[model samples]
Target: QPEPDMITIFIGTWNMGNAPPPKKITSWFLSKGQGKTRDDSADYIPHDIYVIGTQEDPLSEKEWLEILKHSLQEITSVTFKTVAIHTLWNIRIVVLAKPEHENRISHICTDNVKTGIANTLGNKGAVGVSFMFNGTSLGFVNSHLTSGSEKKLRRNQNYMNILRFLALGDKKLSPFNITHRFTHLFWFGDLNYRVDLPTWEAETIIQKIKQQQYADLLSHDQLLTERREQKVFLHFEEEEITFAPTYRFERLTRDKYAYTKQKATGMKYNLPSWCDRVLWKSYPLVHVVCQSYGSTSDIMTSDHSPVFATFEAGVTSQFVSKNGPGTVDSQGQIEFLRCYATLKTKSQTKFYLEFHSSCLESFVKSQEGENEEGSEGELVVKFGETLPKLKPIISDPEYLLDQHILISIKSSDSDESYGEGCIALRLEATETQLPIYTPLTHHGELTGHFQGEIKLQTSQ
Candidate 1:
């Protein structure tokens, strides 16, 4: 029941219109946006996962990734890999995770749906990403729905279309829909929703926005109407918005809400609306933490001001390592990251298994009894076919504190096939070089262990 180290996530959505990303988005990442921060330089806390989405932002994936990489390195040293899933009109849902997690970021998959031009044009719809981290999995969807005041039903259908096709690509590999599959799911983008009232009527109420009465104005929001009626995004929680409407701005130097300065604005343009947003749903296994959910007038790149939210997510951690840190990876056996751990042979003859990119995010106390033998430890990979060559291994008891002992199984061969038998781990005495597995037990063909294989299949 103990929790592992939590991973922080940052989510952002903007209609960049294919222009290059801005120089610095640090302001948007923090709880305070373009406000008087109490630091000489902007402060940053590196997050483990980043799920940033865009609509009509035409930058190529590589170009955008580089921009973010540059910006992030300026704040933190974490290296990230980008997940690219594209739609037309420069719409995409890009994800970035640390490089050490490359193996866990497997099963890169995506789905795109076209709700524009009668479902023929790629101008509108959604792009989604799903991947496994350690043992927990998550899904993300970035969408651009029908744009206009009266297209509520069309947007509702688009939402349904997203749930339907986002999971059905390539022989229905994902059987569960967005709401049911992963421990958590995120759907964000320029949903293109509008206000229900006429321009003047909405402005009259929005004029009172300066007096902090926007809550009353939200009663007429079309998205709220549909949401209240269970037309779309049912059960998904949208944090109460405290920022002003993020749409139909003057599109200025810093993207100010045209109606917010001193006089009424946006009345000549579009109805005040919370058109850009982020929403989430979660299963019992994960918890989402929200630090802030609002828009930044600092990003003046488009008619729509960018909306962003900061969140931390927790997954089922205690159960992951109980099965074994060493599981199956596509490459080779489980390898240590920064430090090598001494895997004292339990019985000199039995070999242990390597889990594939699944382990505790942080080191946890082991259930093993303290060294009753008081001897050093030496580890040999479980299977003969598991490792092609033994890399230089080091020994340090200090690794026990942080769980550097964590391991994942990978294969170098493309055609290797491992048996379904549970891996065998033997403990031997350093004094006598004979098998002596103590109180610890393994489920082999008969005992305690990690199951499954790291085998690869040939072409059909």
Candidate 2:
């Protein structure tokens, strides 16, 4: 089997109609007639790269044709579905794939279910778009949930409506389950939920998401901690020196925006937050790494910063040789025993020595008062027998020189703890041998041992 391919997607929400420069040309232009004029250049630039939505602005078929032209020009693979029309703009769901991998990409959108809400009161919008890649499938649903208290309930209702579409609205089994082919689904947009001071209901929604195993890519544990410490949302921490904020009013001064608006406002008008996000479905084969929320510094583009995610498709084949384990040679076969032995030795030297030393010291200190008592003396004697007598025959420096070291440790009592302790050490070592190093909490929970041998290749 071949190594899995990787794809990076950048998702952003823009208020195109009201954004600055009146007539901006982006990497992509909406379909031909979609623009106000042939040279109008849409409200944004016309580039083939980006997939944009003209929020609350629904154009005629002629405008859609214009959008189709631009979409076709730059995007190699494209799929779209439209929701019910709003006053002027309707929500559009567009999915794109690289030209080279177009053959491997396929997509479908859920049917729109309109609530009897009026567009004038801020209702009508489309459902969402779902994309299927290879045998794995997922969906991306963009929404502008309600903004103010008056419209807040309506926004949540709309949010649930869209969720129902992807989840198949069934209480027992989700649509995603019936559409089992797709293992992962992500729903993100201008959720309008305040990350700094989340409402009780909003927090409940997040808790429920955790229950459902959907990871919020933006404010994962580390990011959440950082936000709490700083008392503000720091979206792009790596590029902190630049200090670009995401949403700010064009006319308002930075101070006014910060004090009055209470919205995200920072130096050069780039205040980042967790309002916009990338969610993920729980699946062993699906791996999400290096997620970044784009900074709005280069130009005064949109109110919301672009969000991106890198997904590495997992290897599909499970190849195991029935040959008895020693050293097996195959193109991709790993010598499990050798790796296990090396890892076991390293764990013992670095981790076990320290841990066991601490444990033994604690045990001995705790037994000090009881050492003279009859039953206590027997217990202490037994404890001493259980402790391993480990000595460093070869120093660490010598071990470092050879990159190999063998240690001999013996337990006074061979029955109760000696064998069990050694077995436990080997098991722990085996478990610690994963290639990636993420923050401890971020790593997957330890459920059980993985029985497989992984081979390492040395370059000549």
Candidate 3:
């Protein structure tokens, strides 16, 4: 269930078509659905976070930041600060949040994957920014995919290549794949998926746009069709688009499509398509409500209309861990642990111990079946007899903070499991306490007891 404390987010994506920055962007950034009244009354709806992505923009990062800051200052009194910004050639993503959220943001990371020119160029690719926002993990990716109406397969390949190469967190903790790494993920930019209709048929839909006859046009959208078949964006979700196609517009115009054939050399005729898009997916527990999903035609500096979405995003205190317990920051060092365990069982029973962690595993089995003749015959043992000497475990300090090992009892001939127990490998002092008794479990019920302890290395 979602808590009462939810945050508002505004995400927008645009393909600038190698255009310069505009002087005024108030209409693009401050729509009524994402706007706040000047008096800041209860009815005013303001965004707490903002993420803007651009593809094929010619302006430098500094100039883009300055333009955004100037535009935001002119619109509202809300103070927004940049949290993360990343650029990969013509593709860039900027993340901003309120200054009050500075302390809640941590573990910030950025990465990029190129998918152009033999898979080594930056002309087409994705740049991502990931961070922990008040315990909830959030990630954003801005990508520029392969163009052309028939290049959907190449665009799908580009999506998978980005997932295979981009990893955000540290490597020691078994960093999760990009798909499952974050609780909330936003992937937006020039996806370059075009309409599947012929030029003549699409022209029919455009002429009837004033009558709001958009259902027939949406039925032939390439991105929607592929998503329906699960060919790409496997589990991602996008808000239903009610606006007209965002690409192939006549440059320097607000409401006209680029339907005319290009007369200049090195130019080809292009059909209007929804090439720019914003899509999202999130964990089931988190509540994400899309309040608005539409494009703005107020700023017409480029060939593509900028699409934006406003969301009332839910925040959570708990998160899913990719690795096992105690997966915090590591010290980049390994330590040794001399462990010993004693068990009271029948002489005929055999058992083994297994050390467990995300990246390490070791096993220790009993040697009671071996006799002086080295034959597989059980030898009777008296009470208070000594157990086998356990091996020294080369362990990382991060792994010893919680549950670390499991001991399983089984008969050698039948291999029937008897019982098992987990032991915590933690230490308060170097070698302070003796071995402690730990309870064993069988079929998920408490049954018997075992004793074990680790003697820590006192010196470096």
**lDDT leader:** 3
* Tens digit of per-residue lDDT, candidate 1, span 195-223: 67765565575575556577776887777
Error of 2 at 17 (Å): 5.2
Model 2 lDDT per residue over 1-460, tens place: 3523344443434433233322223322322211111233332432212233334334554564356444444433344333212222354445544444444445453444344356534444434555444433455555655543234346445544544343322222111121122344444445444323233334343444335332342343333444445322211122111122233324322221121233442112222233444344323324444333333322334444333332333312212234212232222111222111111111111111111211111211111111112232211111222223322122222111111111112222231111101111111122233331111100111111112222222111
How much lDDT does candidate 3 score?
Answer: 0.64
User: Could you tell me the TM-score of candidate 2?
Assistant: 0.42
Ranking by TM-score: 3, 1, 2
User: Of the candidates numbered 1 and 3, which has the greater lDDT value?
Assistant: 3
Q: CA shift at 353, candidate 2, in angstroms?
A: 48
Candidate models: Cα lDDT each: 0.55, 0.31, 0.64
How much is 380 displaced in model 2, in angstroms?
Answer: 44
Candidate 1 is scored at a TM of 0.63
Clashes of each: 31, 33, 0
Residues 310-329, model 3: lDDT tens digits: 77786644322344234432
Q: Sorted on lDDT, highest at the top, how do the candidates line up?
A: 3, 1, 2
> How do the predictions measure up, each by TM-score?
0.63, 0.42, 0.66
